[PDB]
Design a protein around this ligand. Structure first.
Ligand SMILES: CC(=O)N[C@@H]1[C@@H](O)[C@H](O)[C@@H](CO)O[C@H]1O
Ligand SMILES: CC(=O)N[C@@H]1[C@@H](O)[C@H](O)[C@@H](CO)O[C@H]1O
Ligand SMILES: CC(=O)N[C@@H]1[C@@H](O)[C@H](O)[C@@H](CO)O[C@H]1O
Ligand SMILES: [Ca+2]
Ligand SMILES: [Ca+2]
Ligand SMILES: [Ca+2]
Ligand SMILES: [Ca+2]
Ligand SMILES: [Ca+2]
Ligand SMILES: [Ca+2]
Ligand SMILES: [Ca+2]
Ligand SMILES: [Ca+2]
Ligand SMILES: [Zn+2]
Lengths: 264, 274, 258, 264, 270, 277, 132
């Protein structure tokens, strides 16, 4: 496959590398506070984990939309990609599992820490859009399970938190109208790209070519050059994935595929 | 919004827990608390303020940053809202008869109240939601309220006379009147000694630390019977002598101040008059 | 009968207004309240204030009681929703716990004939609930041979009394031990009641005081549920208006009788 | 592989498609209340997530079997398959992770919501049975890790919740004998089919053939025909997986494999 | 030594029978209970009721006190599981919390000398426990110059009085400040003690009243721990029967005491 | 609707279209207060001049109940406790020639935001941290006596026990704004029975009030600093013969007086956790 | 790619930048510690600042070698493309901005738009050889 795509890109034709769980996302675990204060007792905003092929996002409100219009708080999370994926099978599940247990989190400036005690509502009105050059290619409205995205380089998740209008007495004690919220409303989604066809080279969970390249560069104690990141950091390599770095990565992956044919 | 209020901040989850700023917290700021007159009566020292201020100087504070202010009782403390300095702790002694009045004091002081004055002899008034209350302060005012029909007739009273009106407050300093939110109300407040106003409850004043000296927990600082949330800054200790109480405060100031924050300090008082 | 349902089906709309249009609630206030109330038509006054908040004009009823001891003999609770304005008296420490043990819990119950039979607790759950004008329970245990443990079975004075002159008694003695008890049965009737669970159609609003209600039987749990509420009470009109205002929250922490 | 299985099924011989994490389960996130009431404060029953190749099931009791006979509550979860899987490697782990944090859940009729605050016991007496035509082919009693299931079309998980007879004072405050249970006993299992050989065509995390079919049908704005679901919904395609739809799916996947050989 | 246990190990059988048959249980009641019971051999009656619950024929010990003041002069907790039944008084608001502080926590204690030396407190863990028939403690801070602030080093009238006429005091005072003491040595015996952890064979049963007991003298926490129960009384027989038939849930909230001491007091062990 | 105490950097384009006029909505929404000395209402000779003015404010744009009238007796008694209430404030004060520090200290309070801490004179010796620290005392009769110490707590030119050896910076004044040398611990002798003194910090200007000096020359020295005597936008002065010309001038030029002031920067919801009152 | 290729500390005039795609200017304003009386009246310690301190830089790329096509002050190829598209009243297509807005074309400079721009600039160079 690599020498076929080498010979096709040596004549400038379309290529495709088929990846199983591609490492298209750099590691970015962070958050965003749309509503915040130094007390950190009434917060609102999103949290996310972009890792490998998996996006886990969770918008939380501490008030559970008790003063939002129509008791509905709109969340939004836009993930730009570095290369255009094509014909991707994507497992879209609700209820992001990592952001669903209580944790203490440092602030934006790293000064103080704030507490996060989530209770989980289901995501109302999920809209997953697959943008290519700002144009909506595929859209999915409240459909989970396996979805398909034929051509995209931006993933836009638009879920919202709606306060439940009917609550049993076990639920009504969780969300008062006043200030002390010991239980914080949290709504999550999980998006896992199982397989995708990408025109540029990447790394994934199937091949071992990046492992061979890093093993050769680490075995012989090689100095850091002008192109690749120090230590072959794939997060720093896919964070700034320039076309010269793309050409170097494709050449070295092709040679790694050749050596992986000969040397086991 | 000219302080960046519509814009969102973006944390990073992996900042290195930079420094510890408990000593800078305890350096340029001020901590003053209110103690009853019976405290300084049983203390019966003329310069116990010097003793305590040196003991505060042990616990990180500089000398000229701790002030002592008296009050006679919880009724005579509630004749005006006065929250002076940066960090505040308030020391109430429990009394079983003074039952609502402690909750009224904590309801004013702990929460923030955006307030507009009321004109009772001229207009009619109602409450918009749970946050709207009628705070009335003064020397002595009896609040006689009567609800109204939708065609301006008195529900179970007569708006021409004041005897058939229904009283909710008889000769008390500081009332937070809660009435039903739908109907309008005709009011009889003795305005010669009183001042009534409507007040929305806000995000609470995050500094003032109520320290209940004696008793059990009573402070229902909400309106509904459903919630009585004992939050961070409603502490309670027991007393036999006052010296134990003041030594407890001076010892555990490191624990008390880390439960509050000076960022929620207003400018002068505790009424947020528009 | 397994009841299944999907986890992404739509939230139905707020059926709070229909619950207001259908149900029938009644608050139980003490008599000294009605002394301080001083009105002949405050019932119509409050019921029009309830009419403001969605309840129709034939849905709210106002029933009295003299005190906690007089209400403790046969509280009926016939409405759809119930709140009681249980006024705190510091002298009666366990009477409020007795009344809230009665009204807030489901008691499947049986009768008790004291002369004919001997009685015991089958498990932790049942108690000896006795109601009447003057209940003087006297329990003596018996061993596995029906001999008196620390008493004489024919002497009523060597019996070991657990309550006297009390309106509502919920008697607890040891589980597996046989017993014989003495009641002045002319003024008091006793019966053994198991608690199945809680009554979701009743609430308690403790007027003043502190959280004192150990409605459970053991010392090991004193839990505070959602329908055990507490106010602070300077005047009554403040807290009548509090109930009329926050009825949308009080009905929310309760459930329909059926 | 696809043209080999095409030529073997054109003569009616046995075929096998080897899938890595096959999408044999339709998306079915739901629950079941074996014991319930409108108060929703003493509930009992199972919850599950069937998604892709993964079953996460969790039976909960609010009383923690305080009135069950011998303090043991039996749970059971039966998953029927649509096609008969053969020689499946299955990762069976305890302690289902998604149903282990507090959440509020709509009721069966969608009227009210109820609260779920789980504490996790380990699954006592796990029995995983692999049924083919009602006959027990493979059975596994309290064995976790990687298991094998040689021939099956029904998966029966039979785990039970046993109340711990010895509890420290930190545990004994969680489970009273009375009614208010603020901590609810919950017992889970996770079953993930890593790879399986199926005679019919499916979708999985390795191939991109379903992605190619959906990309061709969505790129050219194709009307919904008589067989396939609207928008090529794989959940609705594997929910009602008829033999005519099976034949159409195999034909279109074979042509997709041919085009994926030529067009990258 | 680190223990490395597996997770899939089988639950052992219910060992509450082996706990009942091979341990002891002390019940403490004030003498007002002994004068409201009015029986000569009710210890026999109650112990035969304990015998139904699995406790052996003589493995439940009864020991009396008069009030909270005279029990706190020396609480000698004898046997392996100790429940104390403490009647609520509104005037005894803090001294009940003093006794519940002393019997529900582990303390390291050595004697102190007042005339010769003077002491300070290291952190929030150590406090000054003093017991005896009358403890009038008057303390004054000092500094690096060892001069008294707001007092006089010689004059005892100028001292700052933390407790008078009290059986059991636990003085808390500030840390890192040198303090000079005035204790009636001939009557009161004082010691400084570090709070290690919880003493864990004691159930305080507040018989009546409301939950007030602030053990941790830090005001920011009021830990209502597991072994601090509250029953409401009319007759004592109700309270004793409740303690008898819920005895498994009252031994369950305790554990075995795990501390090797050196004082070597008396114990009612099986 | 969030991020209340962070001070985020905005980013506004320089090609944004200018918004609409906003002045009519400001007139319909907010409130105005006009403070006048009682000699005005003496010379006016009316009981219903408030309604006459309020109908002229109705012509200018304000509603009937949006313009509030309060009064004071003299500059000294207004300066006892100036609590200025509503959304837009403008004060008329006559130039008494013999009092010049009184008006400058009055406008030093009114035209500035003061964050003030309490004081205890019996306990502490007080130094001023920097220039914006002033000592503002108000009450019925303030008499402040300052004693400068050395670095050893020994008074410089003043005995720390004697109070007659102290030197006074003001006597018998209603409001005193005391500036002393920065970094030197000082002992005070304020008459605390009829006067309260407070440790103040000038945060910035007060954004809702203007001062119209009715008659008399330019005297206003806001900043207690000899080199700078700033003449801001809201230190207006007019000359008088009758008061009716002054009231018709302030009613005619509402659209300028409201223009040179703004809404108060602290009183907004956006300044939630930066000293809001 | 986040790596410092060239750096220049307090050097003005003509500079060179060999390989870059981000330009980071880090200048700072220092209050002058010695000021004549004509300067000291400008900057008080108090609030009214009628004269505001301002510090600027100017950075002008005179010539550069870029791998992709662009527009500049030397060629007229973008002018030829816009003249042909505006002379014959051409509808707005899927790729290029309406009216051939170069600001909107270089704001979102996608690789498909890059390929279209390079192809149309090459044809414009061909026609500019023939047609003057
Ligand atoms: C949503 C529902 O349950 N039914 C009605 C719906 O027909 C109507 O459009 C909506 C308006 O908000 O109000 C609901 O009560
Ligand atoms: C009848 C029988 O098999 N007895 C066993 C016993 O040997 C074991 O020690 C105990 C643990 O609790 O479990 C019982 O069921
Ligand atoms: C509603 C609004 O404020 N916008 C109008 C705008 O429609 C109008 O064209 C313009 C004329 O100058 O005046 C603005 O105030
Ligand atoms: Ca009336
Ligand atoms: Ca209300
Ligand atoms: Ca007897
Ligand atoms: Ca029993
Ligand atoms: Ca002293
Ligand atoms: Ca200490
Ligand atoms: Ca002098
Ligand atoms: Ca100065
Ligand atoms: Zn895989």
């Amino acid at each position: 496959e690599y020498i076929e795509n080498w010979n096709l890109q040596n004549r400038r034709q379309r290529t495709g590398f088929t990846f199983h769980k591609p490492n298209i996302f750099p590691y970015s675990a962070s958050f965003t506070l749309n509503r915040s204060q130094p007390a950190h007792d009434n917060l609102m905003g999103t949290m996310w984990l972009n890792a490998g092929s998996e996006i886990q996002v969770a918008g939380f409100d501490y008030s559970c939309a008790i003063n939002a219009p129509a008791n509905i708080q709109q969340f939004e999370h836009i993930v730009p990609l570095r290369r255009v994926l094509t014909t991707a099978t994507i497992t879209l599940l609700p209820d992001a599992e990592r952001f669903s247990f209580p944790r203490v989190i440092n602030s934006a400036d790293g000064a103080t820490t704030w507490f996060f005690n989530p209770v989980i509502l289901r995501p109302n009105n999920v809209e997953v859009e697959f943008l290519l050059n700002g144009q909506i290619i595929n859209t999915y409205q409240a459909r989970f399970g396996t979805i398909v995205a034929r051509n995209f380089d931006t993933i836009r998740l638009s879920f919202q938190l709606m306060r439940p209008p009917n609550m049993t007495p076990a639920v009504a004690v969780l969300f008062p109208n006043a200030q002390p919220f010991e239980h914080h409303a949290t709504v999550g989604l999980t998006l896992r790209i199982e397989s995708a066809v990408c025109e540029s080279v990447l790394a994934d969970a199937s091949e071992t070519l990046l492992a061979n390249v890093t093993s050769v560069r680490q075995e012989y104690a090689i100095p850091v050059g002008p192109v690749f990141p120090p230590g072959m950091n794939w997060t720093d390599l896919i964070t700034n994935y320039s076309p010269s770095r793309e050409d170097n990565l494709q050449r070295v992956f092709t040679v790694a595929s050749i050596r992986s044919m000969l040397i086991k | 919004q000219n302080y960046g209020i519509n814009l969102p901040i973006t944390g990073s989850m992996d900042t290195a827990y930079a420094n510890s700023t408990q000593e800078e917290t305890f350096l340029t700021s001020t901590l003053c608390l209110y103690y009853p007159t019976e405290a300084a009566t049983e203390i019966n020292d003329n310069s116990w303020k010097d003793t305590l201020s040196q003991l505060f100087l042990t616990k990180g504070w500089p000398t000229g940053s701790v002030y002592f202010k008296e009050y006679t009782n919880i009724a005579s403390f509630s004749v005006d809202p006065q929250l002076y300095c940066d960090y505040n702790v308030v020391l109430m002694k429990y009394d079983a008869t003074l039952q609502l009045d402690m909750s009224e004091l904590a309801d004013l002081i702990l929460n923030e109240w955006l307030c507009n004055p009321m004109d009772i002899t001229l207009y009619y008034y109602q409450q918009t939601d749970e946050a709207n209350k009628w705070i009335s302060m003064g020397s002595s005012c009896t609040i006689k309220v009567c609800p109204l029909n939708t065609q301006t007739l008195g529900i179970g009273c007569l708006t021409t006379d004041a005897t058939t009106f229904e009283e909710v407050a008889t000769a008390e300093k500081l009332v937070i009147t809660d009435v039903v939110d739908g109907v309008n109300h005709k009011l009889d407040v003795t305005t010669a000694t009183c001042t009534i106003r409507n007040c929305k409850k806000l995000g609470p004043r995050e500094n003032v630390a109520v320290i209940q000296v004696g008793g059990s927990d009573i402070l229902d600082i909400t309106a509904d019977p459903t919630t009585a949330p004992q939050t961070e800054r409603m502490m309670r200790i027991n007393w036999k002598k006052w010296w134990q109480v003041f030594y407890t405060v001076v010892d555990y100031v490191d624990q008390i101040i880390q439960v509050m924050s000076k960022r929620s300090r207003s400018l002068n008082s505790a009424a947020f008059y528009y």
